[PDB]
């Protein structure tokens, strides 16, 4: 009805960029991404002046629709043209940084995020208010430094992102998970308390959903005890999940299981683990009333094979909780999948700090079936192993298979020290616009 109104208006106006823009928003609402791009492109073209906010939003939406369609070169072209028209709009350099991040060029992304922060030269004025203009740069800077294993700068930017948007579970989850690597649970709870992570019982339960799944038993315990007036059946479910991490035999009423599902504390991975440990629980009945009775039948009754993603999700939970007996049970089931399944199993063990087990699986896999992450793991393992000959060998395998992935060129640069000059050049040939590579070439000329 709103669209039909706009389509009558554009029949008698045609030359109004604003009507076309409004049609693009409606196409956006209805998910017609192809027609939204065309309408937003027409609104930008028909603009009479550059000061219209909707003319700015047109370029932003064009860039986004292009980004959603993985047409990154064309998105960056739209972004750069728009930065030149409107140099005080931060969504355009933000989106450039995001594109660079998902295309694995972290130092170039980092550079842009930092310049968005505390910029006394450009008076940035947002054109959309989805998030606080400074949440996204801090969050992504924290993400980059974490991946670069700079845990201090990660925590600093994760905490500043939290100050901008304290209901974002994502950065809360990141700080807890990062701190769990290095600190006592009580120290982690004290940090959570003085920054007021647990703003309510509800928020505590959403946090508990992450901490139990990662196997943070003591921290989950301190969290749940700090909560007041938790509906008893939800408390029981939480207690049982914590007790399960500690290998207590799981005993839980059907009521606590059902409310544990309703609060999203219990998924099909939990139910399978509990059925494996305690066959008396009414879990078969519970699962078949939740459309996951196929999961039950595959894992326990020789039933038909479930999707590999769902099987890997049950396997992941067992690995993450340290449930090695159940994990071995689950691994015997892999032989009904194609051989390529062992590439993902290898990835799982490596993610949860089982590099030795993961290699056992990586050796099972034909090199064509190894994921990019797998290459990255094997390079990291071999560099930590001081076998830089073999490390560089896998990095070149990465370049040839995944010619567009930045990380394998960078690995070949960092390792092949007696050829760094040619390596940076070979990288620049595939990434002519990457600014870090030029910083690196300048550093070999300073050394040479």
Numbering used by the authors: 183 to 630
Task: Reproduce text from the manuscript describing this model.
GmaR is a four-domain protein that consists of glycosyltransferase, TPR, linker and antirepressor domains.
Based on the expression, purification, crystallization and X-ray diffraction screens of various GmaR constructs, we determined the crystal structure of an N-terminally truncated GmaR protein (GmaR141-637; residues 141–637), which contains GmaR residues 183–630 in the C-terminal part without the N-terminal glycosyltransferase domain. The GmaR141-637 protein in the apo form (GmaRApo) adopts an all α-helical structure with 27 α-helices (α1–α27) that are laterally stacked from the N-terminal α1 helix to the C-terminal α27 helix into a curved shape. GmaRApo is segmented into three domains (TPR, linker and antirepressor domains in order from the N-terminus to the C-terminus) and folds into a tertiary structure that resembles a duck swim ring. The N-terminal one-third of the TPR domain corresponding to the α1-α6 helices forms the vertically protruding head of the duck swim ring-like structure, and the remaining C-terminal part of GmaRApo corresponding to the α7-α27 helices assembles into a circle at the base of this structure. The circularly enclosed conformation of GmaRApo is stabilized through an intramolecular interdomain interaction between the TPR and antirepressor domains. The interdomain interaction is primarily hydrophilic with eight hydrogen bonds and salt bridges.
